[PDB]
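Subject: Interface between my chains keeps coming out wrong

I've been trying for a while to get a sensible model of this assembly. When I model each chain on its own everything looks fine, but I need the whole thing in one frame so I can look at the contacts. Pasting all components below, labels as-is. Any help appreciated, I'm running out of ideas.
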Amino acid sequence: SVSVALHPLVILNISDHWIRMRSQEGRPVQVIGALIGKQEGRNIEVMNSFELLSHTVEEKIIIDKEYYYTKEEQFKQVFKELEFLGWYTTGGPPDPSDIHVHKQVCEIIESPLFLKLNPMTKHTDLPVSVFESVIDIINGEATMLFAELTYTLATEEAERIGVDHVARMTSTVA
Amino acid sequence: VDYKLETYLKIARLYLEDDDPVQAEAYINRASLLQNESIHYKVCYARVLDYRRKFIEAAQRYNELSYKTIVHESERLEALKHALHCTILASAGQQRSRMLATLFKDERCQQLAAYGILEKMYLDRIIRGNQLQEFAAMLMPHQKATTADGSSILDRAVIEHNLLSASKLYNNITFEELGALLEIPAAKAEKIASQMITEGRMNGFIDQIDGIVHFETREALPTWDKQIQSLCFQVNNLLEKISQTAPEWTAQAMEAQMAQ
Amino acid sequence: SIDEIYKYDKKQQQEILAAKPWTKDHHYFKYCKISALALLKMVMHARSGGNLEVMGLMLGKVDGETMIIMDSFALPVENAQAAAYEYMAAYIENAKQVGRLENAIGWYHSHPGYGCWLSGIDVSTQMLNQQFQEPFVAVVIDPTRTISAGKVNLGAFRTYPKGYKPPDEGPSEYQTIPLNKIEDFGVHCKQYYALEVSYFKSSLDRKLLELLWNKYWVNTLSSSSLLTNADYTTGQVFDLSEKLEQSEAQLGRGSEDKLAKATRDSCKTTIEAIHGLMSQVIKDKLFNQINI
Ligand SMILES: CC(C)n1nc(C(F)F)cc1C(=O)Nc1ccc([C@H]2[C@@H](O)CCCc3cncn32)c(-c2ccccc2)c1
Ligand SMILES: [Zn+2]
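Reply #2:
Try treating it as a single job with all components included. I did that and got this:
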């Protein structure tokens, strides 16, 4: 069980991706992306996030791996220290489609995380939920399930100032 | 068709049981060319890799073969046992860390006698003498790789792990207590600590006259900030639990009343 | 319909580009609007750069007299032509098929510790860019003063064409430029003009930020800014002492009244220090003085 730290920039990236796709296509649509960051020992820290390209065949989502590797080389050109960590999507509780996509993603990295945002929520809590994949044996068959992890918010001074400026949006002691 | 492959596998396993691994590996490599033309081949390859002091590959192979549903439950547990044993005494690295994490996430690992050592290695705990004694008792003789002059690899790795894990409990420690906690002579404890600090494995320094090795300092003002953050985290979690275990009642009524 | 700014129509953009009004007037673009995500991306990239300079591009569109910036990406720069343009073209091609339809609208780069202004090289670069690809804008960020002052230091400038002499009309707010960059700020100060900068965000972004504040106040209450910037204050004190020496030399004889400028810099540094101290005093009153 790892301990995950989240950055508000990732949440802003996911929300902007959802808003852009919904406005462009005219109706709300689930988005699928990727996360990058840094892992120290057993502590994971998710820093940034880039969109991913996928297709729908029959009723299943297939992730374009060639585009993923192209974008991986592109971001490795700039952010040398950052590494692939997992994927994200928008929705409610995990569904078998998320299981299929996680099985697809696991071929890239051994133990990816799964972040899910809920854009249509009613409660007063942040709808970000972080899961990890756990393999299990049931009736002699090998399945996988999601175990939720508790996440925090990373502390960066410039990030805090920027998020504060965005949240407020309009003497010196005062 | 498969008679030749079966005979090759039988010869390889007989040679492996005869402690003659060179011919067994050669035969396995030769038969791997014809293997793809068509379960026991993976077992033989994992055993061969285990016999060649290549432990991380054997552990990975055993774990990936532990998920085969066409295999009995007992044999799957035995493969998990082999993977755990190869992981614990594998060379230190990032791949070993990922293997330890994968094994820790596995529930079936909780019914083995080496699970305690897996928990202690993954979570950075102190492994005492008796646990390592039982682990060496359950190990097979080819696993115990020792140099001619001595200095068992497993014992040295366990001592390094103990000293690193003791770096996270103590602000500073004397040589006598460090030698009593690693169960080694104090001079050897000083030598190991100095070697470990020199290569950059640890952060700390040694005061020889006082006989004290000092780990990370943990200054005052950053500690104050971290304690403030933890206290506010406690407040937030307590409010969350109160609000989610007892709605209406105090929670929302007092929230509104405070708002009003 | 706050989200209507996110809807992109290509026909209107082509019509505006083919009917360019900025080729007649010169003080045309006077408003810059930046998305919240783009601003945060620039701030994080500049902070991750460290004490060095980092540069990237700025995608967006135009709307009347407004330059709208939606996203950003970081150029490698370990390079003017070659590598930078290869990265720009490849990134635009990659991002065009995932939903990002806008094209480049500017370039941004950081000015760590010496304000937000355009040097001679930046003015030449902006002139070159506006000669060929128009419209364009240059955003300069000070990632170090942002932490010290608790305010986002950002400035969007646009460069006057060569041979054009505007008649005065410069407010020119005071900037504490270090001593070794005062001469560069003087020669090239009337070759560009600043655009007023505003920020915008969507509805989901607003809701998410409101829900995030319920748990993000802990980091505000445990900041302790007096330790995060201790070398910046030392550099400021060194520069202020040099400026004091120059003002004393001017006094012994006989900028204009360099003593006033040195006093202003000293006041700024001292006020930042006192703010950092009073934050810790408030924390001590709240948490440590509950002695039971
Ligand atoms: C949009 C960019 C890629 N660009 N296009 C064209 C044009 F030829 F097309 C030309 C350009 C272009 O590289 N400009 C430029 C000029 C100078 C610097 C550095 C330079 O002085 C040395 C550092 C000191 C400095 C302080 N302020 C700018 N600098 C940079 C630059 C900024 C940040 C990081 C790395 C480089 C970019
Ligand atoms: Zn510059």
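Reply #3:
Confirming on my end. The interface with chain A takes residues 67, 69, 73, 98, 101-102, 104-108, 122, 229, 240 of chain B (CB under 8 Å).
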